[PDB]
Amino acid sequence: EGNIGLMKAVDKFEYRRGYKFSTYATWWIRQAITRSIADQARTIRIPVHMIE
DNA sequence: TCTTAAAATCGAAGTTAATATAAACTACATAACAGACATAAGAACAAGTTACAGACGTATTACATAA
């Protein structure tokens, strides 16, 4: 899931902004891990809003 | 031909009843819930249509009375 996060982060990276890649990629990989663990870690799915 | 790691097995009942750690905001579309209306289905009353019952009235016969 974090790997998918990297692919999506690379697809929309901007180096005009001058920040390093790790800072932007960490956020997207965080989102990947959290969304996947909210959607697929239970036998009975609990919607994302109820997860938060 | 000789090690060496794997693979498989190891009695019946009986009873037994589980746990417990570890992003937020925003935007949009969809489903659900409630209310009102129209419709189809049933309940109620009343009427009409029809034949039969129940006792009366009639018709018939036989006995009694009158000539």
Short mmCIF file of C-alpha atoms (C1' of nucleotides) in Angstrom, two decimals:
data_model
loop_
_atom_site.label_atom_id
_atom_site.label_comp_id
_atom_site.label_asym_id
_atom_site.label_seq_id
_atom_site.Cartn_x
_atom_site.Cartn_y
_atom_site.Cartn_z
CA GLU A 1 0.00 0.00 0.00
CA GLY A 2 2.87 2.37 0.75
CA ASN A 3 4.32 1.47 -2.63
CA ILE A 4 1.09 2.58 -4.31
CA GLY A 5 1.44 5.72 -2.21
CA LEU A 6 4.88 6.33 -3.72
CA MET A 7 3.61 5.87 -7.25
CA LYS A 8 0.82 8.38 -6.68
CA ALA A 9 3.23 10.82 -4.99
CA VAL A 10 5.72 10.63 -7.88
CA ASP A 11 2.89 11.14 -10.37
CA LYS A 12 2.31 14.60 -8.84
CA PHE A 13 5.70 15.77 -7.56
CA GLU A 14 6.93 19.34 -8.10
CA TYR A 15 10.58 20.34 -7.75
CA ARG A 16 10.03 24.04 -8.46
CA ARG A 17 8.78 24.22 -4.87
CA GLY A 18 12.27 23.39 -3.58
CA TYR A 19 11.28 20.87 -0.91
CA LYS A 20 12.73 17.39 -0.87
CA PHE A 21 10.84 14.35 -2.13
CA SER A 22 10.71 12.55 1.23
CA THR A 23 8.51 15.20 2.85
CA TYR A 24 5.85 14.98 0.14
CA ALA A 25 6.07 11.19 -0.23
CA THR A 26 5.65 10.52 3.50
CA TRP A 27 2.21 12.13 3.53
CA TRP A 28 0.92 10.07 0.60
CA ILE A 29 2.31 6.83 2.02
CA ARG A 30 0.68 7.71 5.34
CA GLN A 31 -2.62 8.11 3.50
CA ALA A 32 -2.14 4.78 1.72
CA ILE A 33 -1.44 2.87 4.93
CA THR A 34 -4.30 4.50 6.84
CA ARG A 35 -6.92 4.14 4.09
CA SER A 36 -5.97 0.51 3.43
CA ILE A 37 -5.99 -0.37 7.12
CA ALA A 38 -9.38 1.30 7.51
CA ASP A 39 -10.84 -0.49 4.49
CA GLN A 40 -9.36 -4.00 4.79
CA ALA A 41 -8.42 -4.77 8.42
CA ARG A 42 -11.85 -5.95 9.61
CA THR A 43 -14.09 -8.87 8.67
CA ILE A 44 -17.06 -6.49 8.97
CA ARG A 45 -16.16 -3.26 7.22
CA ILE A 46 -16.53 -0.07 9.23
CA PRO A 47 -16.81 3.07 7.06
CA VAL A 48 -13.92 5.50 7.15
CA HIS A 49 -15.81 8.21 9.05
CA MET A 50 -16.83 5.70 11.70
CA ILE A 51 -13.19 4.58 11.82
CA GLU A 52 -12.02 8.08 12.72
"C1'" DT B 1 26.30 -47.01 0.40
"C1'" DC B 2 26.25 -43.47 4.42
"C1'" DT B 3 24.35 -38.75 6.95
"C1'" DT B 4 20.62 -35.31 7.58
"C1'" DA B 5 16.69 -32.81 7.67
"C1'" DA B 6 11.72 -33.28 7.08
"C1'" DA B 7 7.16 -35.83 7.85
"C1'" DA B 8 3.92 -38.24 10.55
"C1'" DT B 9 1.87 -40.45 14.73
"C1'" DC B 10 0.87 -40.83 19.43
"C1'" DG B 11 -6.81 -44.42 23.59
"C1'" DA B 12 -11.98 -43.79 24.81
"C1'" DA B 13 -15.75 -41.53 26.90
"C1'" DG B 14 -16.73 -37.29 30.46
"C1'" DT B 15 -16.63 -32.04 30.83
"C1'" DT B 16 -16.36 -27.71 28.47
"C1'" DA B 17 -19.27 -22.57 26.91
"C1'" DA B 18 -14.76 -16.54 24.54
"C1'" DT B 19 -12.40 -11.04 25.97
"C1'" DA B 20 -9.12 -6.68 27.28
"C1'" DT B 21 -2.23 -2.59 22.70
"C1'" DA B 22 -1.63 0.50 18.72
"C1'" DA B 23 -5.41 12.20 11.06
"C1'" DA B 24 -8.36 15.60 9.86
"C1'" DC B 25 -11.06 18.52 6.72
"C1'" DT B 26 -13.79 18.97 2.88
"C1'" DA B 27 -16.66 18.01 -1.05
"C1'" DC B 28 -19.99 15.37 -3.35
"C1'" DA B 29 -23.37 11.82 -4.32
"C1'" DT B 30 -26.46 8.43 -2.65
"C1'" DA B 31 -29.62 6.05 0.35
"C1'" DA B 32 -32.86 6.20 3.91
"C1'" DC B 33 -36.84 8.04 6.35
"C1'" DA B 34 -41.05 10.54 6.69
"C1'" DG B 35 -45.32 12.48 4.89
"C1'" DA B 36 -49.33 12.71 1.69
"C1'" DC B 37 -52.07 11.12 -1.96
"C1'" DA B 38 -54.42 7.80 -4.84
"C1'" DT B 39 -56.05 3.16 -5.40
"C1'" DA B 40 -57.64 -1.31 -4.60
"C1'" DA B 41 -59.81 -4.23 -1.41
"C1'" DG B 42 -63.18 -5.20 1.97
"C1'" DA B 43 -67.41 -4.12 5.26
"C1'" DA B 44 -71.99 -2.51 5.77
"C1'" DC B 45 -76.80 -1.67 4.45
"C1'" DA B 46 -80.44 -2.05 1.60
"C1'" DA B 47 -82.84 -3.49 -2.00
"C1'" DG B 48 -84.56 -6.97 -5.43
"C1'" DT B 49 -85.60 -11.99 -7.20
"C1'" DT B 50 -87.38 -16.55 -6.03
"C1'" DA B 51 -89.21 -20.58 -4.22
"C1'" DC B 52 -91.14 -22.91 -0.39
"C1'" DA B 53 -93.66 -23.29 4.15
"C1'" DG B 54 -97.82 -22.88 7.10
"C1'" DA B 55 -102.00 -22.65 8.02
"C1'" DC B 56 -106.45 -21.30 5.82
"C1'" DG B 57 -110.08 -21.80 2.50
"C1'" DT B 58 -112.17 -24.59 -0.68
"C1'" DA B 59 -114.14 -28.72 -2.78
"C1'" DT B 60 -115.77 -33.32 -2.35
"C1'" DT B 61 -117.90 -37.16 -0.34
"C1'" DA B 62 -120.59 -39.46 2.99
"C1'" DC B 63 -123.64 -39.43 6.82
"C1'" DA B 64 -127.80 -37.64 8.71
"C1'" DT B 65 -132.38 -35.43 8.27
"C1'" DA B 66 -136.40 -34.09 6.04
"C1'" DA B 67 -140.28 -34.91 2.93
#
